[PDB]
Structures are given as structure tokens and as C-alpha cells.
């Protein structure tokens, strides 16, 4: 008895239905002795097989070619022979065999993902399961191949398969994989999978070009010629250590597929080698790399359907801008409302945002929340057709992967740099110069009485004039007028029509 | 009720999946009849025609659901598997 | 579910809000951690939105808790 | 590819017309069964399943298409009929 056959007792039941006359020893046949024990027929009625009254020799059964043969012992020619097939719904067995290969999966959103031509293909309107059924005919056994040519049978197998998928899986889970058209590459181990070996990772995107191990070598003339420019823009000097560390950290975050929204600023003089990296980025990553301008920065994403927002999904790196700042007069300033949502994991986003600008910009709206989103790396020291010809395709993959294996192992954490964030130094200084009233400052009335402080609503308050006279000595209004004028109206409270007070106390008194 | 949980769908039906998954608990001579999709559709049509009374879901306010069961806040007892089927 | 002051500031009826549709069967929703609204430059609380939150129909089962450092000011 | 030209179509089926036109070029024993519309639909369903790879059209930038063929500019010859099939 074979698992491909129907169940045993069902075969016994049909055998019983063949014989109109009742069987005597029907309970004595098991899965191991049916071929041996002859069947005892109590011929109340004439023999159902041959219509004669009774048989001198009992009948017997056997299993040839997956079929039960009913024959009479002694002289078999005196009784007619029946055949009972034992195979059950061959299409269900085909569906079992196809599903055992894990070629089709449920994507948890209502669609199905099909593994054909060494790739995972999305589709919502045209059927792909039937194409997989037609393609897998060769792997299936010989006798199962002929059925998969009729479209009706393929539709039946598809219907069977669709009913056995009750579990959902999530796509694009591993964040340390580089997809490729002919496989997937591992960052932490530096080895390439191809073909069926890449099936375990469910990557639905690719760089769009094949992987060539011949060029990926330790030493080559091309990479030798390229590494000079990178070494020249950032020399390996002790005074250029932290800047080089930030530079190495910011570039190699593009390969990682982690969800993150920490921006980085490329600040430096124009025509100083900063612009060379933008073409190498495209020549390295390829399809996943997308360049854009300030249109995302200016236009409101919430207002109207933005195709860029809908299409940026599953993009490793996005270059925010390519043109100099519009921070001067006559242009819309930088708005922080759009930068809040890009840091959040859900809009799912995967992009890394880098902004290169020759001069520091100004932010219209500002608070403490911007420290976790802004970082800057600066250049201190100091053809086009070659990159378009894909001449340096691997020479930059090697740089990124070597940086990733050198330092990008532990965690994808970007430390923000407040060292030279524009229009932030004065605010950072005033943060340590102004503190809000609290319970801890209430029992200090012995020291605050001489300052003229008054308790309004159980809060220590200060009028504007004292703060203005005690704050104007540290800085000149000529260079820092903008910040103070924009800050005064932000935090003004009116006790009445004539009383204006601020609930902030400078710490220098104590 | 599949995989020890109540599922909700409006576009992909699951009654056929339920019929496919119930085969083992049925009598043996009934199991082999459910392999053909046509018979599964017929059984689904019969089931749909045989439901006339409606029930309300999420009625008990003092139950804590979980992936593998439900927890009773009042008594601190965990019910898993078929024991949690009553609480919709 | 944790969120911020945007739901408080914005009127739910104005425009389609998917989150208001997806709040169905959410046991606890932390509202916001907003600072004082008495300071200049901050919009006051829209009292229209809070009225419909108490109503059983938006089924709702959320518990709303607002954490603030200091007391705000209503309109 | 019908009547020496490539044609798009989004609502009306064109594969059946292609089968009916190609009928002559097939062996003689295969010409009779292409007259039944059901068989033509079955053949269309079969052929829609063997196309898994995709191609891009209008890729060559140095050709002038014409009603009766395609003209090559870099050298100066005219390709007509089947010769123009390779250029989409």
C-alpha cells in the first residue's frame, strides 16, 4: 500500500460494493494479508461477477500497477475479472508536490508571490500561478507531466493550491542583504548566493544588473586610479580624524536596509571633489539609487497624491538635492513640517537622505526635536563620460563594502553633530543660560528676593526689561538680531493688558 | 476559525479553506469526497444557505485576547485552543 | 497606540482620516505629551473633538490619557 | 504582428485573429481544427502561459519606420515585410 493510493478501507468498501452477495470474512483482511487470504462469498444470490450459482474455487485479489484485480482461483477463465484503480485525485498529489517546493507564497496583503526565472514576481491582475505550474512540469514525475498541458487541469491545480495557503509571511525582512539580478550578496560574510540558494531570502527588488566576480578583486588598475581622488579629498591626517570617521560612517549606511531617518549634511566649498561622489553613487547602486531635488522639501506631501512618496518605497538611498541653497531672498525657506514624518518607520520607508550644500541654510521653524534628525560632515582640504560608461561599477561597491565590513557591523547608529549646525549655536548657548521655573526653584526665595522676582500662579516670573538688559551684554545685536527678535515673540506671556512676564530664570545668578 | 483564531475577510473566502482543513475530523468515507473543488463549492453553498441567524462579536469586556489564547481578568485563568472558541 | 497633539488640533470631520477609521477596537490610546499651550504661538484645544470622544459611536473602547508638564489653557 | 505591422490592443482580443491568419502556414492536418472558436480560445489560453519574459519596444534610435517597411539610416537600405519584424 502506497501513500499515493487511496486509503485502504475505502478500497475494501468499493470491493464490497462490487459483490452484491454478502462477504463472510470481510473483517479478516488488513493492509498486510489481502493478497493472500481468499475471499469467502456466501452466494445467497448468483455470483455477481459471472452470474453462475456458486464457485468451486474462492475469489482472490492482488495489487498490480496500483490497481486491485478481482479474479477467481482455480480456473480464472470461468469467472470474469474486475479491475479497481487505487490512485486518488492525481491533481491533489500534483498540488502537494508543487507546494512542497515553496515556490509560491502568501504576501500577507492578499496577493501571491511566484518564484519564476530566478526572481520573486509581484502581480495583481495577470495570473502567475498557472505559469509556475506550466514551468515545473519537468521537476514532477513523468506520469504527472502529461496532465499539466490542458488549461482546465492547470486551473484545477491552481484552485487546489490557493486553498492550502492559510499562513502569511512577510517580505523584505533581512536588512543586511544586497539584491542582484542573478542572486544576493552578503555584507557580513562577503559571499554571493545565486539561483535556488537565494530563494530563502524574499527580496522583491534588485539592482538591475548582474554580478561579476571577475572584476571584484583585491587589486585592479581601475580601483587604484579611483582611490586617489577619495584619499585626496580627505587626507589621512590626525587633524582630519573625526571628519574622516563621519565621512566613512555616512556613506556606508546606504547599503544597509535598516529603516532610519537621520539626515546628513555635506558641507564644503564648490568644486572640491564633493560632486564626484554623486555620480559614483549612481554607478554603484544602480536602480535602487534615485536622485531628486528640493521639490519634496518644498511641496506638501499630505496635500495631493505625491507619486514620489508612493514610489520611494523599497529604495536604499535617496539623494535629497543636487543644486545650491535657495536660502537667500526670493525663495521658500526650509520647512521642518515635512522632516518629521520621514524619520518615522511608516509613511514603509527604507531610504537614507543626504543633502549636499555649499552654504549653511536657515530653518523657519526650530525646536529641540531637531537634534535627533540633523548631522553634518564637512570637507576641509581644497571624466564625466567614464562614469556613465559604467567603467567604475565595482570600484565603488568595493569601497562601500569594505567600509561596511570595517565599521558598520555592530549597529546602524548615526551620532548627530551639533558642532556647526546653522543658526543653532546661539540657541544651544541660550539653552544653558535660560531654565524654566520648577518646584526645585521655589524654596530659593531667600536668594531670589533681591532679584525682584514675583510669584504669579505659584510660578517665579520675570518681566521683559530685566531679561533684555541682562542678556544684551553677552552678544552684539548686529550679528544676532534675527534670533532674538524671532525668539522674543515666541515665549511672551501676558498676565494682564499691562503685565508681560517670562517664566525663565538665568542660572548665572546662582 | 482556522489556526486557533477567528479570521475576517470580505474578498478572499475562507469557507473553502475551512472545508479543506476539516477533512480529518470527518468520518473516513467523507474525507476523500472533499478533494474536488466542485464538491467544496457545493458544500460551501449549502453552508451559506443554512445560516439564517446572526451573532454579535466582541461582547465580553473582561477578556484579554492573545495570539495563542485568552486570559480571564476576573479569575486569572488562561484558556487556549478550543477553550477560547466561545469568546468571539 | 501612542500618538501626539495633531489629533487634538485637527478636526476629525474635516477631510478623511484613516487613523480615525482604524481606531476601531483599540483598548488604550496615549494621546499626547504636549507642553503648555498658554505660551504664545500654540493653538488652543478644539473643544468640539472632545465631545464626540465620550460618545460610544465614532464601536470605540479606547482610554485616553494626556500627560503634560504644566497645566494648559482651553478656548 | 498582423498585416506587416505591430499593433497594440487593450480591450479587443487580437491573438485569435493571429491564429486564424497563421492557420495556412501550419501543417495541413492542423488547419482543420483551428476553425472552431473554442479550440482557438484554448490555444490562446495555452500561448498566454508560455510568455514569461518581457521585451521593450522602440529601442533602435536610427530607423525610420514606414507603412511598408523600415529604412536604415547609417547605411541606406530598405527592409520590407518579414525583414522589418526584428525591429519592434
Amino acid at each position: 500500500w502506497e501513500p499515493g493510493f487511496i486509503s485502504f478501507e475505502d478500497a475494501i468498501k468499493r470491493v464490497s460494493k462490487i459483490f452484491i452477495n454478502s462477504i463472510i470474512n470481510f473483517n479478516d483482511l488488513d493492509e498486510n494479508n489481502f493478497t493472500t487470504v481468499p475471499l469467502v462469498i456466501d452466494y445467497v444470490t448468483p455470483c455477481a461477477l459471472c452470474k453462475k450459482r456458486s464457485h468451486k474455487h474462492p475469489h482472490q485479489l492482488s495489487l498490480e500497477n496500483g490497481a486491485i484485480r478481482i479474479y477467481k482461483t482455480g480456473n480464472p477463465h470461468s469467472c470474469k475479472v474486475k479491475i479497481v484503480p487505487l490512485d486518488g485525485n492525481k491533481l491533489f498529489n500534483i498540488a502537494q508536490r508543487i507546494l512542497d517546493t515553496n515556490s509560491v507564497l502568501l504576501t500577507e496583503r492578499g496577493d501571491h508571490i511566484v518564484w519564476i526565472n530566478n526572481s520573486w514576481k509581484f502581480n495583481s491582475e495577470e495570473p502567475l500561478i498557472t505559469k509556475l505550474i506550466l514551468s515545473i512540469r519537468h521537476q514532477l514525475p513523468k506520469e504527472y507531466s502529461s496532465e499539466l498541458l490542458c488549461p482546465r487541469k492547470r486551473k484545477t491545480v491552481e484552485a487546489n493550491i490557493r486553498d492550502m495557503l492559510v499562513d502569511s509571511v512577510e517580505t523584505d525582512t533581512y536588512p543586511d542583504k544586497l539584491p542582484f539580478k542573478n542572486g544576493v550578496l552578503d555584507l557580513v560574510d562577503g559571499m554571493f548566493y545565486s539561483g535556488d540558494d537565494a530563494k530563502k531570502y524574499t527580496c522583491t527588488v534588485s539592482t538591475g544588473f548582474k554580478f561579476d566576480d571577475t572584476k571584484f578583486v583585491e587589486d585592479s588598475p581601475e580601483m587604484e586610479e579611483l582611490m586617489n581622488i577619495i584619499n585626496d579629498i580627505q587626507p589621512l591626517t590626525d587633524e582630519n580624524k573625526k571628519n574622516r570617521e563621519l565621512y566613512e560612517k555616512t556613506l556606508s549606511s546606504c547599503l544597509c536596509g535598516a529603516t532610519k531617518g537621520c539626515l546628513t549634511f555635506f558641507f564644503g566649498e564648490t568644486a572640491t571633489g564633493k560632486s564626484t561622489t554623486k555620480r559614483l553613487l549612481k554607478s554603484a547602486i544602480g536602480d535602487l539609487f534615485v536622485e531628486t531635488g528640493q521639490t519634496i522639501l518644498t511641496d506638501v506631501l499630505d496635500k495631493g497624491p505625491n507619486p514620489f512618496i508612493a514610489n520611494m518605497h523599497l529604495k536604499r538611498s535617496v539623494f535629497c538635492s543636487e543644486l545650491p541653497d535657495f536660502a537667500c531672498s526670493g525663495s521658500k525657506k526650509i520647512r521642518s513640517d515635512n522632516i518629521k514624518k520621514l524619520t518615522e518607520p511608516c509613511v514603509r520607508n527604507h531610504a537614507t537622505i543626504i543633502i549636499d550644500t555649499n552654504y549653511k541654510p536657515v530653518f523657519d521653524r526650530i525646536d529641540n526635536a531637531l537634534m535627533r534628525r540633523i548631522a553634518v560632515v564637512r570637507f576641509r582640504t581644497h571624466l564625466d563620460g567614464k562614469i556613465q560608461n559604467n567603467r567604475y561599477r565595482f570600484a565603488f561597491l568595493y569601497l562601500l563594502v569594505k567600509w561596511y565590513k570595517k565599521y558598520h557591523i555592530p549597529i546602524m547608529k548615526l551620532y548627530p553633530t551639533p558642532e556647526e549646525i546653522p543658526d543653532f549655536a546661539f540657541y544651544l548657548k541660550i539653552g544653558t543660560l535660560l531654565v524654566s521655573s520648577s518646584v526645585k526653584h521655589i524654596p530659593l526665595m531667600t536668594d531670589l528676593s533681591k532679584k525682584g522676582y514675583i510669584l504669579y500662579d505659584n510660578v517665579v516670573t520675570l518681566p521683559l526689561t530685566t531679561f533684555q538688559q541682562k542678556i544684551s551684554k553677552y552678544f552684539n545685536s548686529r550679528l544676532f538680531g534675527h534670533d532674538i527678535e524671532s525668539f522674543i515673540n515666541r515665549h511672551k506671556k501676558f498676565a494682564n493688558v499691562s503685565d508681560e512676564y517670562l517664566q525663565y530664570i538665568f542660572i548665572e545668578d546662582i
Side-chain angles (χ1 to χ4, degrees), chain A:
Chain A
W1 189 101
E2 219 269 353
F5 301 156
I6 77 193
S7 35
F8 177 78
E9 309 68 21
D10 173 29
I12 316 293
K13 287 315 300 312
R14 36 197 51 194
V15 166
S16 65
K17 315 156 191 143
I18 318 184
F19 298 159
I20 300 171
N21 264 279
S22 302
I23 304 171
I24 303 183
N25 62 320
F26 49 93
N27 288 334
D28 305 334
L29 313 94
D30 58 43
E31 286 186 9
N32 307 309
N33 61 18
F34 46 96
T35 51
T36 292
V37 179
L39 201 63
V40 188
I41 319 99
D42 186 11
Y43 291 100
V44 185
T45 70
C47 171
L49 311 93
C50 78
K51 289 323 294 171
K52 84 155 169 153
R53 193 60 149 211
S54 63
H55 283 285
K56 185 178 178 182
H57 298 110
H59 287 83
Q60 194 169 3
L61 60 86
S62 65
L63 173 67
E64 290 83 296
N65 304 340
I68 279 304
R69 175 167 47 179
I70 294 324
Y71 70 100
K72 181 211 170 201
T73 55
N75 164 275
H77 324 74
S78 73
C79 196
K80 313 333 290 175
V81 180
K82 323 322 181 213
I83 281 313
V84 157
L86 290 204
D87 62 346
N89 193 238
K90 322 172 38 42
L91 301 173
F92 199 70
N93 307 347
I94 296 178
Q96 287 282 114
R97 296 178 144 279
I98 289 172
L99 187 63
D100 289 331
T101 75
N102 305 87
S103 305
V104 54
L105 280 154
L106 197 52
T107 174
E108 202 258 331
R109 293 203 159 182
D111 290 331
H112 290 73
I113 311 310
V114 169
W115 169 251
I116 46 185
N117 285 319
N118 286 27
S119 57
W120 293 102
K121 314 204 91 73
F122 262 91
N123 202 4
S124 54
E125 73 300 342
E126 144 198 34
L128 298 202
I129 310 187
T130 316
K131 304 189 184 182
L132 181 72
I133 298 177
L134 199 59
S135 76
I136 306 299
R137 299 175 297 116
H138 306 293
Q139 288 80 16
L140 299 189
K142 176 184 75 73
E143 64 285 6
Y144 288 173
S145 166
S146 60
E147 325 210 83
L148 293 185
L149 301 180
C150 189
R152 186 177 179 180
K153 293 183 170 101
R154 283 180 288 174
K155 214 162 301 303
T156 301
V157 187
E158 188 216 10
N160 279 345
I161 273 169
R162 214 181 271 261
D163 271 312
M164 323 177 32
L165 288 174
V166 298
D167 177 14
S168 312
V169 301
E170 184 178 1
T171 181
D172 294 330
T173 61
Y174 296 97
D176 52 297
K177 305 282 103 172
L178 298 214
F180 276 106
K181 167 168 41 203
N182 56 2
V184 58
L185 168 65
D186 190 2
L187 311 171
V188 300
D189 293 332
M191 71 66 68
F192 189 55
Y193 285 111
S194 65
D196 313 343
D197 305 277
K199 194 156 68 178
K200 61 165 91 72
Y201 319 124
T202 81
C203 294
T204 60
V205 286
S206 84
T207 58
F209 61 92
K210 299 156 271 302
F211 190 56
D212 199 6
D213 187 75
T214 73
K215 292 185 286 293
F216 203 66
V217 291
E218 188 70 39
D219 284 333
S220 74
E222 301 304 88
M223 70 47 57
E224 181 67 29
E225 275 179 14
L226 231 49
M227 162 294 297
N228 306 325
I229 310 180
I230 301 299
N231 202 1
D232 170 42
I233 306 308
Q234 273 87 335
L236 307 183
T237 62
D238 316 324
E239 60 87 18
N240 205 331
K241 212 50 55 176
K242 84 148 201 46
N243 288 31
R244 191 223 49 69
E245 190 50 281
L246 267 299
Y247 187 41
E248 160 200 352
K249 184 49 55 164
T250 185
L251 316 181
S252 200
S253 85
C254 294
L255 319 88
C256 188
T259 297
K260 190 171 183 176
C262 179
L263 279 73
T264 310
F265 288 165
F266 281 170
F267 182 75
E269 208 259 323
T270 178
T272 48
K274 179 175 73 175
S275 200
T276 85
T277 44
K278 81 211 196 83
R279 282 170 309 280
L280 272 69
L281 261 285
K282 176 149 202 42
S283 185
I285 282 166
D287 189 306
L288 306 173
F289 180 78
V290 163
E291 231 189 76
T292 188
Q294 90 205 343
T295 75
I296 311 326
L297 295 183
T298 62
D299 186 75
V300 184
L301 319 169
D302 308 345
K303 292 178 183 178
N306 202 329
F308 291 97
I309 302 307
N311 300 342
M312 52 59 61
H313 183 70
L314 288 171
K315 290 274 171 313
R316 299 294 191 107
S317 162
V318 173
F319 211 61
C320 191
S321 64
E322 199 51 80
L323 51 91
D325 54 349
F326 271 112
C328 186
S329 54
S331 305
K332 173 45 197 148
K333 288 304 301 206
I334 304 300
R335 52 199 293 251
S336 46
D337 209 349
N338 297 115
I339 87 163
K340 319 315 294 174
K341 63 179 71 65
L342 48 67
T343 305
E344 294 139 12
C346 186
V347 161
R348 307 177 63 186
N349 56 20
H350 274 274
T352 301
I353 301 299
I354 305 184
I355 316 176
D356 48 348
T357 307
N358 290 318
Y359 329 116
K360 267 90 70 176
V362 186
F363 286 1
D364 73 332
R365 205 227 57 74
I366 187 169
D367 63 354
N368 197 351
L370 261 67
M371 326 331 297
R372 198 45 48 181
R373 289 181 164 92
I374 293 310
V376 62
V377 49
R378 187 254 299 166
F379 307 90
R380 62 171 75 265
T381 300
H382 185 268
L383 291 202
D384 79 79
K386 284 185 174 186
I387 304 164
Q388 189 271 335
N389 297 341
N390 312 322
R391 165 192 169 124
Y392 298 116
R393 161 79 48 77
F394 93 92
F396 205 57
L397 307 211
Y398 198 29
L399 298 188
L400 276 300
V401 70
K402 79 176 186 67
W403 285 321
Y404 199 105
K405 67 186 81 141
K406 274 194 189 170
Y407 196 19
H408 279 251
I409 320 87
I411 199 166
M412 272 317 99
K413 182 57 191 174
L414 288 182
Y415 312 145
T417 60
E419 161 265 316
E420 206 62 31
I421 308 179
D423 68 86
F424 264 80
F426 179 79
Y427 286 10
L428 292 175
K429 185 80 185 177
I430 210 161
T432 72
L433 295 177
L434 299 179
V435 74
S436 307
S437 185
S438 80
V439 182
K440 312 185 180 184
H441 296 89
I442 295 172
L444 274 298
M445 279 343 301
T446 312
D447 290 323
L448 298 181
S449 58
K450 307 168 185 162
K451 312 311 154 305
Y453 280 151
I454 190 65
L455 268 297
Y456 184 75
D457 205 25
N458 300 332
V459 180
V460 192
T461 68
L462 176 72
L464 67 98
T465 173
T466 304
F467 167 73
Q468 299 313 329
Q469 56 205 41
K470 292 194 178 181
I471 211 71
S472 278
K473 160 269 163 183
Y474 300 99
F475 61 92
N476 44 0
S477 52
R478 141 74 199 102
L479 289 171
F480 310 104
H482 315 69
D483 300 294
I484 56 172
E485 308 320 311
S486 297
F487 141 81
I488 279 163
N489 57 4
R490 279 174 214 179
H491 323 94
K492 247 40 170 183
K493 288 202 171 194
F494 313 94
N496 56 42
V497 187
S498 48
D499 295 346
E500 306 184 341
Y501 66 104
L502 281 78
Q503 56 276 357
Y504 322 113
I505 297 168
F506 73 95
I507 313 95
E508 293 178 353
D509 55 354
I510 297 303

